[PDB]
Amino acid sequence: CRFYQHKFPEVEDVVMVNVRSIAEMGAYVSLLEYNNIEGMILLSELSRRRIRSINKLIRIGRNECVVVIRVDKEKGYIDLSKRRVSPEEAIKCEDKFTKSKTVYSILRHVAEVLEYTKDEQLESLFQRTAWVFDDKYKRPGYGAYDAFKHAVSDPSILDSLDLNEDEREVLINNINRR
Amino acid sequence: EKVTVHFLAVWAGPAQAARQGPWEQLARDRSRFARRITQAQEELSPCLTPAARARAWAR
Amino acid sequence: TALVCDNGSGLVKAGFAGDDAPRAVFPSIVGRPRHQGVMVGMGQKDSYVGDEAQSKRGILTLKYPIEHGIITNWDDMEKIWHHTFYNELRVAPEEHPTLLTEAPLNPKANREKMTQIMFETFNVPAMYVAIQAVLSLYASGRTTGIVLDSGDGVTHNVPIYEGYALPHAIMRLDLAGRDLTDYLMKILTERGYSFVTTAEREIVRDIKEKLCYVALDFENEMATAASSSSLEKSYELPDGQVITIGNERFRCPETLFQPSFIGMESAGIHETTYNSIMKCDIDIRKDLYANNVMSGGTTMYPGIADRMQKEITALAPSTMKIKIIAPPERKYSVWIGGSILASLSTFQQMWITKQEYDEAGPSIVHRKCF
Amino acid sequence: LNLDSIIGRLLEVQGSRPGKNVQLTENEIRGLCLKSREIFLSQPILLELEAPLKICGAIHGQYYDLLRLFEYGGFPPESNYLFLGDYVDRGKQSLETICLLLAYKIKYPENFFLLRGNHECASINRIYGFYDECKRRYNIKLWKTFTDCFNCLPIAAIVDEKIFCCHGGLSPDLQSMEQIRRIMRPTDVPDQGLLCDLLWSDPDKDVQGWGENDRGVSFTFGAEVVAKFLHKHDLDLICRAHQVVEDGYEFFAKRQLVTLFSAPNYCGEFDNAGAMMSVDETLMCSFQILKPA
Amino acid sequence: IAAFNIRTFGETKMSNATLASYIVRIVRRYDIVLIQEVRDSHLVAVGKLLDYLNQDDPNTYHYVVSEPLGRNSYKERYLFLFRPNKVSVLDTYQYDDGCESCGNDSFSREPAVVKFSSHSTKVKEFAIVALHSAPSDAVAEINSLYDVYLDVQQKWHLNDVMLMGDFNADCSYVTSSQWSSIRLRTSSTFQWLIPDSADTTATSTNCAYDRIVVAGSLLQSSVVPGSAAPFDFQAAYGLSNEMALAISDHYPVEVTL
Ligand SMILES: Nc1ncnc2c1ncn2[C@@H]1O[C@H](COP(=O)(O)OP(=O)(O)OP(=O)(O)O)[C@@H](O)[C@H]1O
Ligand SMILES: *[C@@H]1O[C@H](CO)[C@@H](O[C@@H]2O[C@H](CO)[C@@H](O)[C@H](O)[C@H]2NC(C)=O)[C@H](O)[C@H]1NC(C)=O
Ligand SMILES: [Mn+2]
Structure with missing residues (x-):
C-alpha cells in the first residue's frame, strides 16, 4: 500500500x-x-x-x-x-524517506497479524491509523511517525482509534521492539 | 570585453510561452505507450492466430 | 500507419494507430438547415457536422444517426465519416487502413453496408470491424473477462473469453448517458431551478460529469442528505449565480442500479452482470467473476468501483473470487484498445484487403470480422 | 519556385504576439524541400569563405529569437552569416526555422552558410521532438524528405586559416584536412569514427589530455590537447557552439576558447543569455548578448 | 430597407407568443430588414424567428447572419433578412479590420458587408454596410467608417454604397464641437437623410439616434427625397408605453426604393 x-x-x-x-x-x-x-x-x-x-x-x-x-x-x-x-533539497529526501519508511515498517508488522491479502484492506487499516495523524496534523508522513514515538510515554494516543484490546496490544508491542 | 550589452526586455507578448515546447512532452508520452504494445503483444497475440481464430466461433 | 474511428452515439473518437489518445472528439451529430441562408463570408453549406453543428443547432434539424449503439441512417452516417477524415484528421483515406468499431450483436444486414460504403465510396485500402467491448478488454491488458461497456446511448454487458464475445450472454439495457442527463434535468427542475435557454440546458451534463458520485450506502445518505453539512456542493454558473445541489448528486447514477426510477422494466446493471454469467458455460464462470472490467464514459462516476464490488458479492456463490478493474483511462478504453490492436505486427495479415473484397464481395465481413 | 512569396508570408508575422502558427501548404513545403538539397551538393564539404561576416550559434527551434537575431547585425547581404547547427529540437517552431534557413540558403548561396549539428541526426531528433513535431503539424512522408538533406550538410569551417570553427570539437584522428574531404555523402552518422567525434565532444577545464565524455558516443579533451593542434598548424584560439552557459558565452582556458549558445531563456527553463560574435572586416571580435528578461 | 435594433433579442423574447405576433407583423412590412443586437449564442432565437415567418412558404425570407463578434464575452451577430424573390446574394465577406490579438482592429463589432442583386430597380448593384456601434466607442467607430468605404471600392469596383444602422448618433455622443471632426458630414459626397430634428426614441427624449447614410452617384439619384423617417409603431398599433419598451428601445428606420 x-x-x-x-x-x-x-x-x-x-x-x-x-x-x-x-x-x-x-x-x-x-x-x-x-x-x-x-x-x-x-x-x-x-x-x-x-x-x-x-x-x-x-x-x-x-x-x-x-x-x-x-x-x-x-x-x-x-x-x-x-x-x-539541489544537495540541500536531497538531504530532506533521505530524511523523509527514512521517516515514511518507519511508519510503513510499524504498520507492516500490523498487517501480518490480521493477515491482509488485498491492498484495499491494508489501506483501510492505514486510513484509521497512520493517515489519521497525517490528516489531523496536516503534515503528510511526519504525523504518524511523531505519534508512534510518543506512545512509549503516552499510551493514550491509541485510545481514540477504533480498536479492540487485542488490536491495541500487538501495535504497542512492535513499538517496544524498536 | 567588447560587449554590446542588449538588456532587451519584452516587446512581443508572452515571452515564456513560445520557448518551452510540448514536443518533449509528447514524444515521451509516445514511447511509454509504444512500449505498452510489446507487453500487450506477449499477452494479446495468442488469441490472434489462424488456428485459434477459427476456434472461437466453433465454440 | 492506420486509422481508428470509434463511431459512438454521443462522441466520435478518431485518430491514428500508435497514438495514446484520439485526435478528435466531437458530437456524433449531422445538421441540415431548416431554412435557406448563409454564414457571413461563406458559400452555402448543405450540412454541418460535430462541433460546428452543435453550436448552430438553433437553425438546424439535429439528427443523432446512432441510436442505442446501432447505425440506423446511412445518408447521415456517410456525412459523419466524411467530416472525420477530411476536416478533423486531415488525411486521405486511400493511404491508411481504417479500423471501424461496431456495437455488440449488430444485425447482419447492418454489418454489410458498413463494409460496402468504406470500399466503394471512400476507396480505403483496408478495413476491419471490431466489437467495442472486445477492444476495451484488450486495452486493459487481459484476454479473458466480462466488460461493462456503458456509454451515452446504450449499455451492454459483454462477457469475452479468449478474445471473442459470447453471443448467448449479451444483455441490452436501454438506460445510458442521455437518460441520466434527462433525469437530472427533471429532478433539478423539481428543486425549483430553470434551464430555459439552450446555453443553460447543455451545462446540466457538465454538472453531472464533475460533481456526481455513487453513494456507498444509499439508505443512510438519502436521510442524511438535507442534514449533512459537507455533502451539498456549489457549482458556479457562467453569469455568476450559484445554485446549491443536494440529494440529486447521488440519486442520479442510482438510476443505473434501479432503472424503474425512469420507467424501464429491465433489470439493473448489477443484476444483468449476474444474469450474463449464468447464461455462460459453467466451465468459465470462475474467470468471469474475477475480471469485471468497466468501460465507457458513464462508468466514470467516482465511487462506482466500490459499489459494484459490494452488490455482486451478495449475489454470487459464497467463495467466488470477485475483482472489479476500473482502469483510469476508461473514458477512451474502446478507442485506445483499437489503437493497440491495429499496431500489432501479428494483426497485419488479419486486415480485410482491397483484393479480397473484389473477389468475395461485401459478404466477406462475416468471414473475417467477428 | 517563387521564393519571395513564401519568405514574405513567413516574415510578415514578425512582431506579432508569440504563438501564431504559419501554415504553408504541403506542396509548398515539399517545394521548399525539393529546391533546397541541390546547392549543398554543388558546393565543397569544406567551405572556403571571405570576411566580413556575422557568426552565430545554436538556435534549438526558438524561431521568434531567430527573427529577433537578424534585426541587429544586418540582413544579407549587408553582412554575411554562418550558423553552427542545433536548430531542430526542443523549441516550438523548429519547422519554421529550418524552412526559413533553406530558403535563404537558396537566395544567397554564397552569403549564408549552415553546418551540421548533432541534432541533424535521425536517431536524435527522433527522441527530442522534431520527429514528433512533423507528425502533429504535417506528416511522416515529408519527414523522410528531411532525412535526405541533412545527410549532405557540411560539418566545419576555417576562417582565413586563423579561426577554426566547427560544431563539436577536435579528434585524435584528425591529422590532415584531406581526411575530412574524403568522407562521403550522403551519410548517416556512424556509431564511431571522425564524423561522430566532430559533432559531439566538449571541453573540460579540469582534465589533462583525453578524458571520458558524459555524452558517451564520443570523448572529452583537455587543455594540453588544445595547445598541440593549434601549435602544429600555427593557429590561434578557437570558437565553437555547443553547450549551455549562463552568460551566453564562457571562456574556460584563460580566454583561449569561447562557447556560443544563441537561444536566450532556453526553452523556458533557464535564465541564461544568448550570445552572437560580431567580426568586422579586420577580424576584430565582439559579442552580442541577449540579457535575461 | 430597415435597420432594427431589437433590445435583447433572444430566446426569452421569442418564446412570448404575444411579442412574436407583433415582431412578425413589423418585419413583413419590409423586403429587407437588418436586425441588430442579436444576443443569441446558439442561434436558437434566429431559428425560431425564421420558423414563424416561414411556416407556410419555406422561401418567404432568407437570412445572412454573422459569427459572434467581439473583444470580450459580449458578442453580437448581424442578422440580415431578405426576400429571395426580390433580391439575390452574390457574395458576402467580413471586413478584415486586422489583428485583434495585436490590439489594432479598428472596430469591436466589424461591419458586415453584403452584395445584393436587385432586378426590379434602376440601380443594379449596391452594398449595405451594417454597424452596431459600441455605446462607449461611438466617436472612434463612426470615424473608422471612412476607411470602410475605400475598402469596398477595391474588391467590387463599386462606388455605390449605402451605410445604415445604429450609429448611436446624438447630442451627447456627438456634441456640436465634435461635428466638425466627422469628415462624412463635412464632405458633400454624403447626403444625411435623417436630420438632427427627428425623434427616433420611444422614450420622451428627443434624440436622432438612428441614421441612414448613402454614398455613390447611381444610388443617390434612386433615393426618393424625404422618404426616410421613423415609423412610430406605437401610434400605428395603438400601444401603451409599457409594451413599447418591452419590444425595443429603438424604432425601425425605413426607406422606399
Ligand atoms: N465524468 C463523467 N461523469 C458522468 N458522465 C460522463 C463523464 N464523462 C463523460 N460522460 C458521459 O459519457 C458519455 C460519453 O461516453 P462514451 O464516449 O463512452 O460514449 P460513446 O462511446 O460515445 O457511446 P457508446 O459507448 O455507446 O459507443 C456522454 O453521455 C457523456 O456525457
Ligand atoms: C411575454 O412577456 C410579456 C412581458 O415580458 C408578458 O406580459 C407580462 O406578463 C406577466 C406575467 O408574469 C404579467 O404579470 C405582466 O403584467 C405583463 N406585463 C405586460 C406589460 O403585459 C407576457 O405575459 C409574456 N407572455 C408569455 C406567453 O410568456
Ligand atoms: Mn550540438
Whole structure:
C-alpha cells in the first residue's frame, strides 16, 4: 500500500525513485512512496546517448530523490526530474524517506497479524491509523511517525482509534521492539 | 570585453510561452505507450492466430 | 500507419494507430438547415457536422444517426465519416487502413453496408470491424473477462473469453448517458431551478460529469442528505449565480442500479452482470467473476468501483473470487484498445484487403470480422 | 519556385504576439524541400569563405529569437552569416526555422552558410521532438524528405586559416584536412569514427589530455590537447557552439576558447543569455548578448 | 430597407407568443430588414424567428447572419433578412479590420458587408454596410467608417454604397464641437437623410439616434427625397408605453426604393 491518503503526488514535490531500466528515451523508475507505480525521469540535461548512460545509472543503488514535473491522472503518466534537485533539497529526501519508511515498517508488522491479502484492506487499516495523524496534523508522513514515538510515554494516543484490546496490544508491542 | 550589452526586455507578448515546447512532452508520452504494445503483444497475440481464430466461433 | 474511428452515439473518437489518445472528439451529430441562408463570408453549406453543428443547432434539424449503439441512417452516417477524415484528421483515406468499431450483436444486414460504403465510396485500402467491448478488454491488458461497456446511448454487458464475445450472454439495457442527463434535468427542475435557454440546458451534463458520485450506502445518505453539512456542493454558473445541489448528486447514477426510477422494466446493471454469467458455460464462470472490467464514459462516476464490488458479492456463490478493474483511462478504453490492436505486427495479415473484397464481395465481413 | 512569396508570408508575422502558427501548404513545403538539397551538393564539404561576416550559434527551434537575431547585425547581404547547427529540437517552431534557413540558403548561396549539428541526426531528433513535431503539424512522408538533406550538410569551417570553427570539437584522428574531404555523402552518422567525434565532444577545464565524455558516443579533451593542434598548424584560439552557459558565452582556458549558445531563456527553463560574435572586416571580435528578461 | 435594433433579442423574447405576433407583423412590412443586437449564442432565437415567418412558404425570407463578434464575452451577430424573390446574394465577406490579438482592429463589432442583386430597380448593384456601434466607442467607430468605404471600392469596383444602422448618433455622443471632426458630414459626397430634428426614441427624449447614410452617384439619384423617417409603431398599433419598451428601445428606420 502507498504511504499517504492521496494516490498520486502533487506537482513540485520531490520524491525518491528506483531506476528500473534504461531505454532510448530515458529511465523508467519506481516511486518508493506510491506502491511502486511507474514513472519516468526525463533526460537529465543537454543531450545523451544510451552507451555511457550507465554512468548515470548508479542511482539504481542510490535511490535518488527527484521532483515531479508533470502528472496526468487520466492517462496515468508521471514525469520526474533529477537535474533540478539541489544537495540541500536531497538531504530532506533521505530524511523523509527514512521517516515514511518507519511508519510503513510499524504498520507492516500490523498487517501480518490480521493477515491482509488485498491492498484495499491494508489501506483501510492505514486510513484509521497512520493517515489519521497525517490528516489531523496536516503534515503528510511526519504525523504518524511523531505519534508512534510518543506512545512509549503516552499510551493514550491509541485510545481514540477504533480498536479492540487485542488490536491495541500487538501495535504497542512492535513499538517496544524498536 | 567588447560587449554590446542588449538588456532587451519584452516587446512581443508572452515571452515564456513560445520557448518551452510540448514536443518533449509528447514524444515521451509516445514511447511509454509504444512500449505498452510489446507487453500487450506477449499477452494479446495468442488469441490472434489462424488456428485459434477459427476456434472461437466453433465454440 | 492506420486509422481508428470509434463511431459512438454521443462522441466520435478518431485518430491514428500508435497514438495514446484520439485526435478528435466531437458530437456524433449531422445538421441540415431548416431554412435557406448563409454564414457571413461563406458559400452555402448543405450540412454541418460535430462541433460546428452543435453550436448552430438553433437553425438546424439535429439528427443523432446512432441510436442505442446501432447505425440506423446511412445518408447521415456517410456525412459523419466524411467530416472525420477530411476536416478533423486531415488525411486521405486511400493511404491508411481504417479500423471501424461496431456495437455488440449488430444485425447482419447492418454489418454489410458498413463494409460496402468504406470500399466503394471512400476507396480505403483496408478495413476491419471490431466489437467495442472486445477492444476495451484488450486495452486493459487481459484476454479473458466480462466488460461493462456503458456509454451515452446504450449499455451492454459483454462477457469475452479468449478474445471473442459470447453471443448467448449479451444483455441490452436501454438506460445510458442521455437518460441520466434527462433525469437530472427533471429532478433539478423539481428543486425549483430553470434551464430555459439552450446555453443553460447543455451545462446540466457538465454538472453531472464533475460533481456526481455513487453513494456507498444509499439508505443512510438519502436521510442524511438535507442534514449533512459537507455533502451539498456549489457549482458556479457562467453569469455568476450559484445554485446549491443536494440529494440529486447521488440519486442520479442510482438510476443505473434501479432503472424503474425512469420507467424501464429491465433489470439493473448489477443484476444483468449476474444474469450474463449464468447464461455462460459453467466451465468459465470462475474467470468471469474475477475480471469485471468497466468501460465507457458513464462508468466514470467516482465511487462506482466500490459499489459494484459490494452488490455482486451478495449475489454470487459464497467463495467466488470477485475483482472489479476500473482502469483510469476508461473514458477512451474502446478507442485506445483499437489503437493497440491495429499496431500489432501479428494483426497485419488479419486486415480485410482491397483484393479480397473484389473477389468475395461485401459478404466477406462475416468471414473475417467477428 | 517563387521564393519571395513564401519568405514574405513567413516574415510578415514578425512582431506579432508569440504563438501564431504559419501554415504553408504541403506542396509548398515539399517545394521548399525539393529546391533546397541541390546547392549543398554543388558546393565543397569544406567551405572556403571571405570576411566580413556575422557568426552565430545554436538556435534549438526558438524561431521568434531567430527573427529577433537578424534585426541587429544586418540582413544579407549587408553582412554575411554562418550558423553552427542545433536548430531542430526542443523549441516550438523548429519547422519554421529550418524552412526559413533553406530558403535563404537558396537566395544567397554564397552569403549564408549552415553546418551540421548533432541534432541533424535521425536517431536524435527522433527522441527530442522534431520527429514528433512533423507528425502533429504535417506528416511522416515529408519527414523522410528531411532525412535526405541533412545527410549532405557540411560539418566545419576555417576562417582565413586563423579561426577554426566547427560544431563539436577536435579528434585524435584528425591529422590532415584531406581526411575530412574524403568522407562521403550522403551519410548517416556512424556509431564511431571522425564524423561522430566532430559533432559531439566538449571541453573540460579540469582534465589533462583525453578524458571520458558524459555524452558517451564520443570523448572529452583537455587543455594540453588544445595547445598541440593549434601549435602544429600555427593557429590561434578557437570558437565553437555547443553547450549551455549562463552568460551566453564562457571562456574556460584563460580566454583561449569561447562557447556560443544563441537561444536566450532556453526553452523556458533557464535564465541564461544568448550570445552572437560580431567580426568586422579586420577580424576584430565582439559579442552580442541577449540579457535575461 | 430597415435597420432594427431589437433590445435583447433572444430566446426569452421569442418564446412570448404575444411579442412574436407583433415582431412578425413589423418585419413583413419590409423586403429587407437588418436586425441588430442579436444576443443569441446558439442561434436558437434566429431559428425560431425564421420558423414563424416561414411556416407556410419555406422561401418567404432568407437570412445572412454573422459569427459572434467581439473583444470580450459580449458578442453580437448581424442578422440580415431578405426576400429571395426580390433580391439575390452574390457574395458576402467580413471586413478584415486586422489583428485583434495585436490590439489594432479598428472596430469591436466589424461591419458586415453584403452584395445584393436587385432586378426590379434602376440601380443594379449596391452594398449595405451594417454597424452596431459600441455605446462607449461611438466617436472612434463612426470615424473608422471612412476607411470602410475605400475598402469596398477595391474588391467590387463599386462606388455605390449605402451605410445604415445604429450609429448611436446624438447630442451627447456627438456634441456640436465634435461635428466638425466627422469628415462624412463635412464632405458633400454624403447626403444625411435623417436630420438632427427627428425623434427616433420611444422614450420622451428627443434624440436622432438612428441614421441612414448613402454614398455613390447611381444610388443617390434612386433615393426618393424625404422618404426616410421613423415609423412610430406605437401610434400605428395603438400601444401603451409599457409594451413599447418591452419590444425595443429603438424604432425601425425605413426607406422606399
Ligand atoms: N465524468 C463523467 N461523469 C458522468 N458522465 C460522463 C463523464 N464523462 C463523460 N460522460 C458521459 O459519457 C458519455 C460519453 O461516453 P462514451 O464516449 O463512452 O460514449 P460513446 O462511446 O460515445 O457511446 P457508446 O459507448 O455507446 O459507443 C456522454 O453521455 C457523456 O456525457
Ligand atoms: C411575454 O412577456 C410579456 C412581458 O415580458 C408578458 O406580459 C407580462 O406578463 C406577466 C406575467 O408574469 C404579467 O404579470 C405582466 O403584467 C405583463 N406585463 C405586460 C406589460 O403585459 C407576457 O405575459 C409574456 N407572455 C408569455 C406567453 O410568456
Ligand atoms: Mn550540438
